[PDB]
Coordinates of C-alpha atoms and ligand atoms in Angstrom, one line a residue:
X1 CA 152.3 175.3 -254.1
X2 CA 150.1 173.5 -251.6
X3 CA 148.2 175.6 -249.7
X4 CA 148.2 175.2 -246.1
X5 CA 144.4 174.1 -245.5
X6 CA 145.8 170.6 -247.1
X7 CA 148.3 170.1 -244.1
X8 CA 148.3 168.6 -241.2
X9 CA 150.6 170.4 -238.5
X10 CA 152.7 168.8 -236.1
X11 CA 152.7 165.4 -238.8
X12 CA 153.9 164.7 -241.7
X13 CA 150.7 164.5 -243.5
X14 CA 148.5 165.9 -246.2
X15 CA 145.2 165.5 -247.4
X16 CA 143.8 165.4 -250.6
X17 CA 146.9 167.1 -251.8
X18 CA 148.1 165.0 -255.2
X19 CA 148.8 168.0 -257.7
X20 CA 152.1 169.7 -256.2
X21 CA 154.6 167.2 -257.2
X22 CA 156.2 166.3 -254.2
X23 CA 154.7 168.4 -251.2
X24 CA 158.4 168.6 -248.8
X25 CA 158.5 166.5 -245.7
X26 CA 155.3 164.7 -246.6
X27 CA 155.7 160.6 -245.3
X28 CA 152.5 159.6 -245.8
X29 CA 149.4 160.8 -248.1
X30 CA 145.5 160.8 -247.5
X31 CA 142.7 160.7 -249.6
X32 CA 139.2 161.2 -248.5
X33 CA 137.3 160.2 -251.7
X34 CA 137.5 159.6 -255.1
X35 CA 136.0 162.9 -256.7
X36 CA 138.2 163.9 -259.3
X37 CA 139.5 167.6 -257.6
X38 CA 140.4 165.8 -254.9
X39 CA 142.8 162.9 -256.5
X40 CA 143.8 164.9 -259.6
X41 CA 147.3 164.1 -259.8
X42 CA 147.3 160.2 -259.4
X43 CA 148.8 157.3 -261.8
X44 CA 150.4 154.3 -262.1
X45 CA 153.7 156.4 -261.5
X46 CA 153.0 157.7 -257.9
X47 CA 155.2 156.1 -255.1
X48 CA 154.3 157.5 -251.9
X49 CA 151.9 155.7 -249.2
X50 CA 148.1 156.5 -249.7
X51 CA 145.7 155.9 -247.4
X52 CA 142.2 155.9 -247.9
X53 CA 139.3 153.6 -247.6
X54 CA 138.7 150.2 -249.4
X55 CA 135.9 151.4 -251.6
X56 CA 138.5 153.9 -252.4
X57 CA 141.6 151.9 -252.8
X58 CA 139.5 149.8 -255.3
X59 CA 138.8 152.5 -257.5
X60 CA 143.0 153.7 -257.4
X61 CA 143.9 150.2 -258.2
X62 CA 141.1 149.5 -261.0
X63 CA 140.8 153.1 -262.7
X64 CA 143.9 155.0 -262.3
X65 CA 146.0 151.8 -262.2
X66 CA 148.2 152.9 -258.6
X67 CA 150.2 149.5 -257.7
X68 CA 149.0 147.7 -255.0
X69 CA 152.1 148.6 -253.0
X70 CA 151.5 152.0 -252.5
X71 CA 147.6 151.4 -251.6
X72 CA 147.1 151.2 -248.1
X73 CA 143.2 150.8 -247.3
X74 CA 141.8 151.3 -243.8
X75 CA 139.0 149.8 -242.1
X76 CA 136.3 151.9 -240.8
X77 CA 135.5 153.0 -237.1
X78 CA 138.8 151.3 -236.3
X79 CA 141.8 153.0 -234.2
X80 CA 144.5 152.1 -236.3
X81 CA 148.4 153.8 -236.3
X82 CA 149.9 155.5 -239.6
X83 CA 153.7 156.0 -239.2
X84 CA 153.7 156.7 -235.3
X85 CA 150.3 158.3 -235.4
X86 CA 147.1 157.3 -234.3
X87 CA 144.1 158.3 -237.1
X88 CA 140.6 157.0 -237.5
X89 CA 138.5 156.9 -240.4
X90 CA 134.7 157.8 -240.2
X91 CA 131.9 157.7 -243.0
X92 CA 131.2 161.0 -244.0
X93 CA 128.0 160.2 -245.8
X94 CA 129.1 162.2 -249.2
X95 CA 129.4 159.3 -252.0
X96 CA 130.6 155.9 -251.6
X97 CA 134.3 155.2 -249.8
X98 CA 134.2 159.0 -248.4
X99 CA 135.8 159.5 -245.6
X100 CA 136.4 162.0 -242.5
X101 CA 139.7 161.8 -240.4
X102 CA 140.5 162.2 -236.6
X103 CA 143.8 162.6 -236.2
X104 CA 145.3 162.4 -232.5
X105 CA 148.8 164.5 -232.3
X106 CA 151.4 163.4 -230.2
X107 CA 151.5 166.8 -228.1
X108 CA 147.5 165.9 -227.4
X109 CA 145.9 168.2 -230.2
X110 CA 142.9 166.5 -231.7
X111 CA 142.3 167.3 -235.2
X112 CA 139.0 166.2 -237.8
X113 CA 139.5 166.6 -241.8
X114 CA 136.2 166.4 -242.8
X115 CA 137.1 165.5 -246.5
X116 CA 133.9 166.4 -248.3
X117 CA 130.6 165.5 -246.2
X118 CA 127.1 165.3 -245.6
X119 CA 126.4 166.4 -241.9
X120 CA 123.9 164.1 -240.1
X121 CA 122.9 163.4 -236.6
X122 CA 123.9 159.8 -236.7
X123 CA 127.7 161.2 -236.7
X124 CA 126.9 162.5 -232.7
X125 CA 126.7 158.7 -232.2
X126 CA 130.0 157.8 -233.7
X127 CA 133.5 157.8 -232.5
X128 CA 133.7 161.4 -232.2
X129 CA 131.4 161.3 -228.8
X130 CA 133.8 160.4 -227.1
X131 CA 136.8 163.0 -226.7
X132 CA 137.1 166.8 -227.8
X133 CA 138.2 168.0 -231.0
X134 CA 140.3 170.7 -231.1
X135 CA 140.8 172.2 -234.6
X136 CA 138.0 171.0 -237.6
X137 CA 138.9 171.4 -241.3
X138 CA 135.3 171.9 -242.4
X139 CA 133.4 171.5 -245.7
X140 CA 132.0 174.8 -246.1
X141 CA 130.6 174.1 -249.6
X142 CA 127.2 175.5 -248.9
X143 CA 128.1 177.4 -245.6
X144 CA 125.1 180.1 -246.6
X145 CA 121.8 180.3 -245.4
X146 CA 120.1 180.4 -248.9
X147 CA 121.0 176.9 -249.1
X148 CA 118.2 174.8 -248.0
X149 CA 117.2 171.4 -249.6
X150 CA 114.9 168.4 -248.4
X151 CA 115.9 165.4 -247.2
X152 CA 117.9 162.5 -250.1
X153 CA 114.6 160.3 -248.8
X154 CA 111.9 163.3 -249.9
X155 CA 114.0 163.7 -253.3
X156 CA 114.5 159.6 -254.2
X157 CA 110.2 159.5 -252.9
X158 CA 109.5 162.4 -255.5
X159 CA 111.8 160.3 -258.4
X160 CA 110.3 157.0 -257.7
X161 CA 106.7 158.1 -257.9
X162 CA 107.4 160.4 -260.7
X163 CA 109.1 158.1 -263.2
X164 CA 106.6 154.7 -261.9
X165 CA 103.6 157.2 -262.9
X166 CA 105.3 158.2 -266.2
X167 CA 105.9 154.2 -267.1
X168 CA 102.8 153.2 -266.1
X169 CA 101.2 155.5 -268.2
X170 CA 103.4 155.3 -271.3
X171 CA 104.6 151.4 -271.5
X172 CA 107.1 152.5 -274.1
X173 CA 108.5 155.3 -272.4
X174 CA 112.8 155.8 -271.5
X175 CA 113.8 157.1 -268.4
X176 CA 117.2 158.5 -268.1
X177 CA 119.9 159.6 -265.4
X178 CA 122.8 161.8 -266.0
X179 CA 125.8 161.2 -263.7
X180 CA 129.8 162.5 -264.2
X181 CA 131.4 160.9 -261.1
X182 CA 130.6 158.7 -258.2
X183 CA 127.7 159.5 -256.1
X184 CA 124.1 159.6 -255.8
X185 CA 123.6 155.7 -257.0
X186 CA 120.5 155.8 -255.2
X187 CA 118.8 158.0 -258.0
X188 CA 119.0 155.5 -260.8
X189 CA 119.1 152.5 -258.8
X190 CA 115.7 152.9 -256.9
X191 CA 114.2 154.4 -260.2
X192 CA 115.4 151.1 -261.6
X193 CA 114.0 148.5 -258.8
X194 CA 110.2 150.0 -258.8
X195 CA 110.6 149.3 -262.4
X196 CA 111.6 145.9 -262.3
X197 CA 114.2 146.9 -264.7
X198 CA 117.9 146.9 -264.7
X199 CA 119.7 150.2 -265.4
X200 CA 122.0 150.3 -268.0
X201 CA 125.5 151.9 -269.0
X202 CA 128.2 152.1 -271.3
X203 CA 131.4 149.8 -270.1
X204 CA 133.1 152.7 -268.2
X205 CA 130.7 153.2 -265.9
X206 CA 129.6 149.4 -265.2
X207 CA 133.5 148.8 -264.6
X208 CA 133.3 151.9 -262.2
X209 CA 130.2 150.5 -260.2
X210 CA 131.8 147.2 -259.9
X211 CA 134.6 148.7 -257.4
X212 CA 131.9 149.8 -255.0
X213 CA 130.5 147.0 -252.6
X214 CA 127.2 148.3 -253.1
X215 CA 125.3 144.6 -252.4
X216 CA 123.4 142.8 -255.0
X217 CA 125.0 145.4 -257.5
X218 CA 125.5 142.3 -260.3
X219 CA 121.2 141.9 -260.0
X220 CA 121.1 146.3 -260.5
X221 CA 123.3 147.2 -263.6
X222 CA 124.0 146.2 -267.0
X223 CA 126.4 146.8 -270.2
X224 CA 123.0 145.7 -272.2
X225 CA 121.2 148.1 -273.0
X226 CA 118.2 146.8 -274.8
X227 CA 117.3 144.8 -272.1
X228 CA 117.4 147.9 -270.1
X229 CA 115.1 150.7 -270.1
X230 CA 116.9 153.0 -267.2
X231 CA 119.8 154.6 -269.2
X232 CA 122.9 156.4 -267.5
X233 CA 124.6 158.6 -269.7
X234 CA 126.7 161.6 -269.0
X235 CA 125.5 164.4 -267.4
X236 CA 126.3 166.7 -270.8
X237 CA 123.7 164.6 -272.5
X238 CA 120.8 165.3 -270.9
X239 CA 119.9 168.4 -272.6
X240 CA 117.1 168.2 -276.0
X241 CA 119.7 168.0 -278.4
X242 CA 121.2 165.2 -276.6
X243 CA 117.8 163.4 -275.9
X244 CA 116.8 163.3 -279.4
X245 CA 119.7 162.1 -280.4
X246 CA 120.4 158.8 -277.9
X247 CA 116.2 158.2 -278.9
X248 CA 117.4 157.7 -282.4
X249 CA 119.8 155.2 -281.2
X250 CA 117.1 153.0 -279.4
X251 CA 115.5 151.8 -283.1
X252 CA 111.7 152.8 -282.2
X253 CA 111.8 150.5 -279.1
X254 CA 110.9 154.0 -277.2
X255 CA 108.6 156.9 -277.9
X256 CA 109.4 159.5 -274.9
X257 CA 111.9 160.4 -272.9
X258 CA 111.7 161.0 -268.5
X259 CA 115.2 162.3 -267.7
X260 CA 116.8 163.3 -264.4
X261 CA 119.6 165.8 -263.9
X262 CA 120.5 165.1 -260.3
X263 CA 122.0 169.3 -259.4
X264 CA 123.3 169.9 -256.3
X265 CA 122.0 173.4 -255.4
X266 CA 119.5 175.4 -257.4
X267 CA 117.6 178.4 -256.8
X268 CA 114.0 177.3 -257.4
X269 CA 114.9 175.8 -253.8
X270 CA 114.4 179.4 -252.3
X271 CA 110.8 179.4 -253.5
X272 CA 109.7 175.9 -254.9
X273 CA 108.8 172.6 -252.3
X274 CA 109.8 169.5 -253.7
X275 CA 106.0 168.4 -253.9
X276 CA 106.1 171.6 -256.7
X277 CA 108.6 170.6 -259.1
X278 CA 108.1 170.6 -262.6
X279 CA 110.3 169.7 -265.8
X280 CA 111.0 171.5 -268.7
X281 CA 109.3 169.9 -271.7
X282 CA 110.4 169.6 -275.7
X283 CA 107.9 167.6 -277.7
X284 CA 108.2 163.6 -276.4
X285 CA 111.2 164.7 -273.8
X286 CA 110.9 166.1 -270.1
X287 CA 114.0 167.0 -268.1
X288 CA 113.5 167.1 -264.3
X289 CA 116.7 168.8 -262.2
X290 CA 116.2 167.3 -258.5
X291 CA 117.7 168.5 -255.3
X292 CA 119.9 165.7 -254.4
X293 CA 122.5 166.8 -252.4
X294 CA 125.6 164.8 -251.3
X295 CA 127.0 168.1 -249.3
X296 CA 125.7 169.9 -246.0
X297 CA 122.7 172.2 -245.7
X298 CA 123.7 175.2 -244.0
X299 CA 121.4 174.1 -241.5
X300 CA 122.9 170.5 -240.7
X301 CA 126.4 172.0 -241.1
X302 CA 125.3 174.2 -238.5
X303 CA 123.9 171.7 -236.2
X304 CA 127.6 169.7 -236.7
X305 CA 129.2 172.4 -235.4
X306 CA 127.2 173.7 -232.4
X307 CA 127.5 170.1 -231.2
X308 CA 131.5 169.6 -231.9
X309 CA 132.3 172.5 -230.3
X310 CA 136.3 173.3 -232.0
X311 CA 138.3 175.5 -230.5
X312 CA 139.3 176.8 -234.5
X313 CA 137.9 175.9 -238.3
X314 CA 139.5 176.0 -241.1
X315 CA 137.2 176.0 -244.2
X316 CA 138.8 174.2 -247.0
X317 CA 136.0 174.9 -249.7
X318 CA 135.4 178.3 -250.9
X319 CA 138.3 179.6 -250.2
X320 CA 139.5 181.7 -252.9
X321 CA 138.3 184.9 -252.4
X322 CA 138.3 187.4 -249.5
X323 CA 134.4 188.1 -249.6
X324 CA 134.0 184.0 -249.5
X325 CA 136.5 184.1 -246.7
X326 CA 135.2 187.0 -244.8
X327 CA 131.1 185.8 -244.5
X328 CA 132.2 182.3 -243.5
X329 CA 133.9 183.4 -240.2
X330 CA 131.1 185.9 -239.7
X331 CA 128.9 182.8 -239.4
X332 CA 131.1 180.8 -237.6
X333 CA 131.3 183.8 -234.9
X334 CA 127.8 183.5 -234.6
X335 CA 127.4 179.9 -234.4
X336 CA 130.1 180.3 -231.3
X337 CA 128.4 183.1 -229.3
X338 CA 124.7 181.6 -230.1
X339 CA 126.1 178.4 -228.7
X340 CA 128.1 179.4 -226.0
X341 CA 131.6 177.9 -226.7
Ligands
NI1 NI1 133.3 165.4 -253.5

């Protein structure tokens, strides 16, 4: 049934809440982002409002095949009123058409869905400034203080240079990126530009890219891919077995292979600087795993916090077991008595 982190009380809202069949006394449906946990449970058969953003409405319309009826995209930043309520979207820098959520109740309650997010100080400039939130329903995904990683600009520095060096080099070298959702464009697409390449994919994925208004995207990516030589294939691939094979495909254009696997978290981050990564190496084929995260540190998901200042949380990842359950609101105590709210 759906659990009760997915509702909003005092509405007749949910978010992200698409596999329950019909969730009872539920007008009008959100959806933060098109990650597949989050809209599993959408067709061409659903007929309840969703709201979401453009980016996101694009991708419902185009790849699950929702009717344009039943799409209801939102501008950003923009104070607009969903079935007597007033509700705000807000970029939640996660992948592209994420958003967050400020819903104003009737009674005066204030209320922020963070869908899934990538805390930054840029948000203390936004629309939230200027009122108090009361409750926050908070991506806790990494909400442990293991979890460190550098900065999305250190990580894309390190691939640039990296795969540039490698080229430069080896003229007839491939470079590849894994992916298995949206997200993390940036990777292959600035890998691709100091290059002076396009990258290239099968039709799937191009048709997928094409819903995002990323700008010049029809000068970045390409169905042909022997005038490409920045490959996207699915993150299962990029393993040896994998490698070898797709370098059989490319007919002796290509004698070695420079592959990224863009992980979220990994523990060589609780040792290894990003200056000190290395790859693991087959014969002709390196695979680098890079720490590009789309999610919070436990350090900028700290920082959000301190500064909001709710008067409850409600974690809505990582909530499954009682040991889970039981560390996070240890840390939130602390944040609150450190703090002084
Ligand atoms: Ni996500």
């Amino acid at each position: 049934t759906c659990p009760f982190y997915k509702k909003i009380p005092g509405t007749g809202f949910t978010v992200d809440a698409f596999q329950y069949g019909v969730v009872e006394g539920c007008t009008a449906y959100f959806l933060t982002h098109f990650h597949s946990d989050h809209y599993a449970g959408l067709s061409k058969h659903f007929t309840f409002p969703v709201y979401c953003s453009e980016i996101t409405g694009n991708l419902l319309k185009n790849k699950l095949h929702v009717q344009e009826q039943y799409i209801h995209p939102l501008p950003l930043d923009t104070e607009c009123i969903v079935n007597g309520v007033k509700v705000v979207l807000l970029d939640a820098n996660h992948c592209p058409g994420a958003v967050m959520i400020l819903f104003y109740l009737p009674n005066g309650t204030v209320i922020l869905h963070t869908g899934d997010f990538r805390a930054d100080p840029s948000m203390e400039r936004s629309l939230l400034a200027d009122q108090k939130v009361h409750m926050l329903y908070l991506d806790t995904t990494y909400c442990s203080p293991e979890y460190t990683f550098p900065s999305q600009q250190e990580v894309i520095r390190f691939a640039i240079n990296t795969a540039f060096e490698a080229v430069t080099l080896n003229p007839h070298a491939l470079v590849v990126c894994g992916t298995y959702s949206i997200g993390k464009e940036k990777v292959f697409l600035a890998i691709a530009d100091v290059l002076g390449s396009k990258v290239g994919m099968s039709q799937e994925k191009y048709k997928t890219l094409q819903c995002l208004n990323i700008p010049e995207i029809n000068s970045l990516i390409t169905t042909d891919m022997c005038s490409s030589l920045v490959h996207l294939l699915p993150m299962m691939q990029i393993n040896f077995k994998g490698l070898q094979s797709h370098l059989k495909k490319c007919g002796g254009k290509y004698n070695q292979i420079l592959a990224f696997r863009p992980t979220g978290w990994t523990h060589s981050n609780k040792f290894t600087r990003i200056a000190d990564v290395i790859p693991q190496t087959k014969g002709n084929i390196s695979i680098y795993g890079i720490p590009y995260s789309e999610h919070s540190s436990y350090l900028e998901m700290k920082r959000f916090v301190q500064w909001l200042k709710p008067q409850k949380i409600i974690p809505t990842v990582n909530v499954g077991t009682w040991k889970s359950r039981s560390t996070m609101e240890k840390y939130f105590r602390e944040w609150k008595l450190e703090a002084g709210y």
